[PDB]
Point group: C4
Chain length 97, copies 4
């Protein structure tokens, strides 16, 4: 189909974004007055919180670039998740018959 | 129906996730350099904030596992709530006649 | 209509929740080891952040009850806003002709 | 069309809100007991976090007005993003034929 397949697949996109932003924000903060976004195994848990947009505050970028990577990893979530909602929004309309 | 019943019921699923993650993240952090996620009556209020994805920051996991439980209790919310939006999105289309 | 009127009106409901939770969480925290949720003009800005679910962390309840009021003022937002999305989701389908 | 064009365009609205709230919250906090919302290049990253509603906590307004600008820059996001979800919700229904 699409509405049901454009989603199940997109997520496989967000996950890339995560791992992508993770091992990129680090190399953007690793050397500077910034928080623990100086470790790959740390950026991960950050990508996730950011992507889910929960913002624990426990971690965040301070590097101009690191902040960019944040924005990206953000929409990725607001978006990657939106589709899943879209998918469901129609699969509830697919019961109009 | 479905669109209107697949929701009212799913929530009864998220609530399980809460209580589920609550009394699981604790036993994952209870003994370690981590925050108050060392008390069941505390993990709760955390499951909720996390699930609603508000991330007060007042509490969060530091245990690799405790972080997993977080992720889970997270989607549960982004999702459990999405349906409710889906439900409503169609119940507004159910006025096309 | 509905999809377009059930929303514009619901918000007038959330706003009540705000002012409602505001001047209720205070009288729940006002006298205790809790944060500034001890002032009505402060609970407001909290209801808002909470309702929008942004969780600055700058403020939060510590009173068991105050935490309840939080939950409420939370869904109110996840929900009150969901409808508005629902409304829009259909007003985009109302262009199928 | 609309559902697909009312979105791609709205965002160009939120971005204005950002830059708009950015260089406005500052001049509202710049001179007071408030956080770094005293620098334009700082308010930005705040508008974004706020707009995405992630609330890192790293920054927030304390000025009554600065708090207003927050609210605004908030809905702008909850809303500007909602449409995009709406758009997608229908573009999944546009496969009912
Ligand atoms: K959020
Ligand atoms: K948040
Ligand atoms: K926070």
């Amino acid at each position: 189909a699409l509405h049901w397949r454009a989603a199940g697949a997109a997520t496989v996109l967000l996950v890339i974004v995560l791992l992508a932003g993770s091992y990129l924000a680090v190399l953007a903060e690793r050397g500077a007055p910034g928080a623990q976004l100086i470790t790959y195994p740390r950026a991960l848990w950050w990508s996730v919180e950011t992507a889910t947009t929960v913002g624990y505050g426990d971690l965040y970028p301070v590097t101009l670039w690191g902040r960019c990577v944040a924005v990206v990893v953000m929409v990725a979530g607001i978006t990657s998740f939106g589709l899943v909602t879209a998918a469901l929004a129609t699969w509830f309309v697919g019961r109009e018959q």
